[PDB]
Amino acid sequence: MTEHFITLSTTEPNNNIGIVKLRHADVNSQAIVAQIVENGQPKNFEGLQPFFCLMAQEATGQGVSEESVVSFDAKNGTLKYVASDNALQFVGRNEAYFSFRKQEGGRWIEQFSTRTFHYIVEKSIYSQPFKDSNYWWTFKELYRIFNKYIEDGKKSWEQFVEANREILESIDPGGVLLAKVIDIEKIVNEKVPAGFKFVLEHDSEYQPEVKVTSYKNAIGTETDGFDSGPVFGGGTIYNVPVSLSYDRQKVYVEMPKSYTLAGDIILIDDGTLLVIKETQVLCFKMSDAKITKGYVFVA
Template sequence: MATITHKLMLSTTEDNLVGEVKVRQADDETQLFEVTVLENGTIKNFAGLKPFFCLMAREVTGQGVSEEPVTSYDDTKGTLKYTLSANAMQMVGRNEAYFSFRKELTNGAWAEQFSTKSFYYTVEKSIYTQPFKDSNYWFTFKELYRLFNDYIDSGKLTWEDFMDSESDSWKNFIKQNREIIESIDPGGVVLTELIDARKPEDKASFNNLARRLDFTDQTTLVANSAAQYNTDPRTKFIAHRGHEAVCPENTMKAFELAFLAGYDGIETDAQRSADGIWYCFHDDTVDRMTNGTGVFTDLTSAQINQLIIDAGNGVSVYPGERIPTLESCLSYCKKVGLYPQIELKKFTNDSDLESFCNLMKKYGFNNNQGTILCNYTAAPGLRNYWPEAFLTVFYTNTPEFDKHVFSNTPYTAVGIEQSLLLSDISVLDKYKSKGVRVGTYTITQSLYESVKNLGLDFIGGNVVE
């Protein structure tokens, strides 16, 4: 079984909000906590000390006291890797744990020098830990599985077709194999749970359990993956079109995964439908990303709402995504605390600018709580409707550009495309020295090392690939 890595940033001084970390019982030796230890926001060197994984006792049952030495770590870099054992998964439900750093005394005892604050992870039940784990069960279960698939294959039916239209056949199958079924699953509890496991709460059912597990594993892999890169509190990490590296771009799932990954904000593109509804979509046409065709701004909201995203990274893991409205994006950002960078792709009249500004104001994204990305030539029109709007203007090397920026410094940031920035670093000092916020975008993982120490106010891109 493949190793699932959970990348965690754990502090010794601040509460640890690691997001949702889930593991399944019986998956011991496959779940890895890859930890960076922090103290007051900086990496903590624990040279000369031995790390221990400590599982806290559960208040009600008293179960769960466990301490295990960590064998893989780099003490000078403040990192460690701990593979969860069966002891770490003994309790189903929410578990509280921490890492302790200890010094060995002359008598062989260990004395704790410091520890991380607690963090939480959830252990879920596994079919392999149910109380029928014996050779007879495995034989009969495999036999039942073979018979069931033979039954479906004989009629060339999918599972959904079988359940929807072949209830008589289903009853026949049960009757013919009742003895096997009752020997391993009295009352049909296991079979019912397997079917129910395909459908998460508040989500559509997956075609099969394997696809549901792929979805869960991918989401787990994403959690906190960006947080490991950004240890500079001055810099906002912005996920380009959401977390498009693992999920179709500019979808609600891409925004949710950006939040799980530890990004500070998301960048998305705003376009208006023919009947005046703002959406998150990048291209001029819907052809590349959806099952439809046509110019985006020529389509009504009713037409756009029918489109299904059928392209992009991870589309097989996250199928059926739709084009989200800008309002749903802003509402989610406000709810979870993501910083939105909204690029105004195109507008045709002042009515477009007014409705766009009103939507941003509705969710309180002013005073640099959020920003509008635009060309500086569009800025005056936006400021007519929203004087205190915080704008990030795309850099151009012209006197007119500088005049606009320096006359609106409190409400303006400069966004410099990475190739322009790296070709002339002095442009950064020109603006930073006068109090103008500066950031860069289209940064990939390979380019990150070149910009991470420049003191930028934001870095936009997909650092986690």
């Protein structure tokens, strides 16, 4: 595959770079190798993800392309971007830049970027047909189809229950089975990890063991200040049964419903995280890694 080496600055204009010349129909062969420079020195972008930003033409307002760069050496301030079909769409002079981003979910934390630079796409025997952008339509239709599933799914369910009403009335006489299952329900809400799902982000590439404990009135948690509670030092310590699940640098800790506690998340500067809600404390201890962030699971 062909490579095009250029050094791009965040401070100075990028006019002195060589002529970048791409061919219109080149698939994933032509790559732009760039050295990011800030005030003459290489730019460390550790913890940031680079993005290729192609600017649309001012006339039509078409051709904006934001694409995540696959290969980069953040330490040495270099990146390799493989021209996309989108980058090669306009045959002629193109204007683009690199943007570096940090996002904690659905919101940016910090972003910096290079100065624009220009490149040229040369004409090929092939001419790629491009569909007009419809991100809004695809979104509003998926939302409509999903809202149609709500309306139709409600009507289908209510008809199902009412048709089976006659067989649901005669299922349990008095409440012999109901009384029982309610005793199984309270024990499932306490002794089996089912309800409460907490996420611990970490520094290990592996699957660190997590141990969870629950206790009330620990030092400095008491309502009326230090040593005001009935049992000094803390009450009964309950080992919380957990169900562990792992992704890269993420542990999913599943606990029984009863241990659900939404309070203040305190991170200790080691392998420990606490959740404190008034007097109640939920303690997470990690073996062989450091918890970097902790939060209640949301889908």
